């Protein structure tokens, strides 16, 4: 219901501001970057259904 | 305009709303001041000047629309700054009276002021002359207890701001727009709007 401004910001209205195909030879680094994006979009003290909206990597395949 | 400065619903205490300018006090929320600016700030300047370093200077501000005859307890530097900040048409004056909370004492409606029952007649007349509203010496804090404006803010129960006895402190009644606090009751706000022909 509250869009997250992207430089992640306004995460469910969060005034705090944090820091889509991603081609890369280093698959481990690309996957690690995807995990960092998922780690950034971390819900705190929120219901799972209420926090169902999040940044999850759709797919990872060779470019 | 039933809006509360930050979480405080004492709009009249925070801001002495008058038709020409809303005598707001410094220390209020910037968004609330902008909200007061959006509601009636364009018609009534809502510059937040803390008279004598008071965030509730609007309660004690005895300056109405025609004249900013606030008490002399207001800071001279702030009053001088406000004189340059606000237009010269408002008869800005320093009411050197023992009752420094003259604005709370005087229900300075733009049509006719209502000074405190124990307020000095000379001080009331001086405030009346600047405000261009005949004073009426008549709780002693007539301005604080009952909101006063030319449009009309009805009277306190003895009530604006969720039944608060200090309607004037809760509701910043002005001739241009009878503002109030966000806590003002819907029936009370509608009655005040009906009294203000709105």
């Amino acid at each position: 219901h509250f869009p997250i401004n992207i430089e992640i910001r306004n995460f469910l209205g969060e005034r705090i501001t944090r820091v889509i195909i991603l081609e890369g030879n280093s698959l481990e680094n690309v996957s690690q970057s995807a995990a960092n994006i998922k780690q950034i979009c971390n819900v705190r003290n929120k219901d799972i259904r209420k926090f169902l909206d999040g940044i999850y990597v759709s797919e990872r395949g060779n470019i | 305009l039933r809006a509360q400065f930050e979480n405080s619903n004492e709009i009249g205490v925070f801001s002495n709303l008058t038709n020409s300018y809303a005598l707001v006090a410094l220390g209020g929320s910037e968004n609330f001041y902008s909200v007061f600016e959006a509601e009636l700030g364009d018609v009534v300047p809502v510059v937040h000047t803390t008279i004598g370093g008071t965030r509730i200077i609007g309660r004690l501000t005895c300056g109405n629309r025609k004249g900013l005859l606030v008490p002399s307890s207001t800071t001279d530097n702030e009053l001088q700054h406000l004189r340059n900040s606000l237009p010269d048409p408002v008869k800005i004056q320093r009411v050197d009276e023992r009752l420094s909370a003259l604005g709370n004492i005087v229900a300075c409606n733009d049509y006719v002021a209502l000074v405190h029952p124990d307020i000095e007649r000379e001080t009331e007349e001086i405030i009346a002359d600047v405000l261009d509203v005949e004073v009426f010496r008549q709780n002693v804090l007539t301005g604080s207890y009952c909101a006063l404006s030319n449009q009309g803010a009805l009277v306190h129960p003895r009530t604006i701001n969720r039944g608060s006895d200090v309607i004037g402190a809760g509701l910043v009644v002005n001739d241009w727009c009878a503002f109030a606090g966000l806590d003002t009751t819907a029936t009370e706000l509608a009655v005040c709007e009906s009294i203000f022909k709105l």
């Binding site: - | 510059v47 001279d76 530097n77 010269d88």
Partner: protein, 120 residues
């Protein structure tokens, strides 16, 4: 669950808790009884059993006997249970002064011991 509640109570009692030996055994029994009573409030038979065990342990003669009595009381209790702020706002901008330079420029306040602003 009953087993989970008993384990939590036992863990809390362990974390919190001849005459000295008898007193220590009685204090441990009383602490366990108080924890069980508090959980039940949030039982009468358990409290009566604990009181009887405390009275029996009050006249204990050996440390082993006190330990056996405490173990029996713990077993009986187990059985019973199982049963903004940085933005700079300038007041000079909101001014009606004819000269913008004058509005943005400060004026003298006091000079040579005399209030210039209050005497001009």
């Amino acid at each position: 669950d009953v087993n989970t509640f008993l384990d939590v109570v036992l863990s809390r009692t362990q974390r919190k808790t001849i005459s000295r030996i008898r007193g220590f055994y009685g204090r441990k029994v009383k602490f366990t009884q108080d924890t069980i009573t508090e959980k039940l409030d949030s039982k009468h038979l358990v409290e009566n059993v604990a009181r009887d065990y405390i009275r029996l342990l009050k006249y204990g003669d050996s440390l082993y006997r006190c330990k056996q009595l405490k173990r029996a009381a713990l077993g009986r209790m187990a059985t019973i249970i199982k049963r903004a702020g940085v933005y700079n706002v300038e007041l000079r901008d909101k001014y009606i002064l004819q000269d913008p330079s004058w509005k943005y420029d400060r004026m003298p306040e006091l000079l040579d011991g005399k209030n210039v602003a209050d005497f001009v």
